Design a protein around this ligand. Structure first.
Ligand code: HEM
Ligand code: HEM
Ligand code: HEM
Ligand code: HEM
Lengths: 142, 141, 141, 142
């Protein structure tokens, strides 16, 4: 699905992602932009304002876990279904997350990379990442 | 439906776009064609290559339309009526494709105006672009 | 956005529902719970069994709300404001679920009023239920 | 996916479907209710009004073909992917049909069966058919 020169483009820009921060920024933005996703993180405390969500420590910490998982997918870009199987069970059987939301999180992640890299997130770089996030959303949907 | 704060947000972010609206509108189109190649089927008679002057002229038209949607954020069906007839009656654009262009536009703005693309603004821009999309996909009078 | 013909259609089909609105609203809920069991998660404290008096009372409330959306088809955000606060701010219903209830309602009306469920009416009812859905999923003021 | 008593319910009501007419009624309704789907049937002539669409002979005739295919799926409710493979290629590679539209056609078909069978299209019968049409939509999406 990804050409050798678009697998390489993806890895190069990913080696520059702050893994402590980007994951939180994405999960944060999901909860602000699509406010019904807050229903699934009811235990995380105060999610009452954009400021509250973005500074909530448990959002920051869960976003590290989610980004951890995308990085796992980026190491195994062939065998994404096998990478994400356990996580598909969890998001369905136990959480009941509608799969459209998986697509929304991938798109929000694309915007956060745009926002951090600026000019260097070129149209061809974006297109390689759109293939990557669609892959992860499909692997997760049960 | 937009909140009053949504409207202030969109009016102020799009105000900062200003005279790059044409250049951003072209870049958003070029992102959409590369990342979602099925959208090229609506533009069969265009040069769709990188730097095409026809894509750059189309991006100016799209941007100038968004500028007018913002100036008429309270009465959009009326301001966008001819556009609605073009996209819904004549071209019959599947609504899925409005979600693709909208995403490409957000991505373009994130890359160009990072200091303005706060979570609150991101949320208000996304709701505005969905309201524009709904007007353009609907056959109404 | 609804056309003027859409509005006449919905006003006249829903007028024919009349005093079965409560019974249809219960049946639509029961279809939704059987066919899409994840929607039961929003109703954890209800008896959801067949013939439950709590589902039949909830179907009357849903139906009576649709009757008022029809009477205020031109100013729905204002007429549906408290409902919008309940579903979007308090319950946080994922918008996917509004497409499920809407479909179940169309199916209920098709089964009960076949002579009224013409293609044109079907089209206008579907657009009305999507406009109601959009008001209820939006946090606005 | 379908219990033995919901496979049987599905077959019983399907043995009563007018295969010359229901397929057309469904395709007709798709073009009226979701008007952008008309873009894909531009060769079928006049689709200008609900009356025109519903009486168009080429809509009636294509709807027989589509219903033919659902009946093929209902005979092979295990191996739906293998039943619909050629048709998935055609709808993607050649037609470029977004897969959300496959879901819309299945739902319209459910409403047409509601409209024809009335009281006998009970909630449990509807739920078995919702499993059937989701199956067909998934098998078709590439
Ligand atoms: C799209 C890519 C996504 C990935 C890669 C991802 C990954 C993860 C991971 C790694 C966990 C932790 C599992 C564990 O620690 O055992 C998790 C848990 C969870 N995810 Fe996701 N997730 C994604 C999307 C979503 C979305 C869209 C939602 C909700 C809208 C969601 C809601 C949750 C919830 C509620 C949990 C449990 C959190 C908790 O422990 O309290 N996820 N996910
Ligand atoms: C915010 C979303 C959009 C806006 C503001 C927009 C605006 C416009 C404008 C201003 C025009 C030119 C009308 C004229 O020259 O009189 C136009 C034409 C067109 N649009 Fe859009 N558009 C949008 C979304 C889309 C999407 C998603 C598609 C397809 C994927 C699309 C396909 C076209 C096509 C094919 C034309 C005809 C261009 C030509 O043949 O010269 N538009 N649009
Ligand atoms: C047309 C669509 C809908 C309408 C007109 C509607 C209308 C209503 C009304 C009138 C109430 C009662 C409010 C009150 O008693 O003051 C209500 C409550 C509720 N609705 Fe909806 N509703 C719709 C869609 C949905 C959907 C799709 C869901 C979830 C799948 C949902 C879940 C609920 C819940 C959980 C309650 C709270 C009921 C309770 O705890 O007693 N509604 N709705
Ligand atoms: C969801 C179930 C569907 C099934 C079972 C189905 C089945 C078929 C079949 C059997 C054919 C004929 C193929 C042949 O004769 O070789 C066909 C062709 C076609 N289908 Fe579908 N289809 C479905 C959905 C759709 C949808 C949603 C669209 C468009 C919105 C669509 C557009 C077409 C078109 C354009 C053709 C070619 C028609 C022509 O020959 O001019 N189909 N489909």
């Amino acid at each position: 699905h990804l050409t050798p020169e678009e697998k390489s483009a993806v890895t190069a820009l990913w080696g520059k992602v702050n893994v402590d921060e980007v994951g939180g920024e994405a999960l944060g933005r999901l909860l602000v932009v699509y406010p019904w996703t807050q229903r699934f993180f009811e235990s995380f405390g105060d999610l009452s304002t954009p400021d509250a969500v973005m500074g909530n420590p448990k959002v920051k910490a869960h976003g590290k876990k989610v980004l951890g998982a995308f990085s796992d997918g980026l190491a195994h870009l062939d065998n994404l279904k096998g990478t994400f199987a356990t996580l598909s069970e969890l998001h369905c059987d136990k959480l009941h997350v509608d799969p459209e939301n998986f697509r929304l999180l991938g798109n929000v992640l694309v915007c956060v990379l745009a926002h951090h890299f600026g000019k260097e997130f070129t149209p061809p770089v974006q297109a390689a990442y759109q293939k990557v996030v669609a892959g992860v959303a499909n692997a997760l949907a049960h | 439906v937009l909140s009053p704060a949504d409207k202030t947000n969109v009016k102020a972010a799009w105000g900062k776009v200003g005279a790059h609206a044409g250049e951003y509108g072209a870049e958003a189109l070029e992102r959409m064609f590369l990342s979602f190649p099925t959208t090229k089927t609506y533009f069969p008679h265009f040069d769709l290559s990188h730097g095409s002057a026809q894509v750059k002229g189309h991006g100016k038209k799209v941007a100038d339309a968004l500028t007018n949607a913002v100036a008429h954020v309270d009465d959009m069906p009326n301001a966008l009526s001819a556009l609605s007839d073009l996209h819904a009656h004549k071209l019959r654009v599947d609504p899925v494709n409005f979600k693709l262009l909208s995403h490409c536009l957000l991505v373009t703005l994130a890359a160009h105006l990072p200091a303005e693309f706060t979570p609150a603004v991101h949320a208000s821009l996304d709701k505005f672009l969905a309201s524009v999309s709904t007007v353009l996909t609907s056959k109404y009078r």
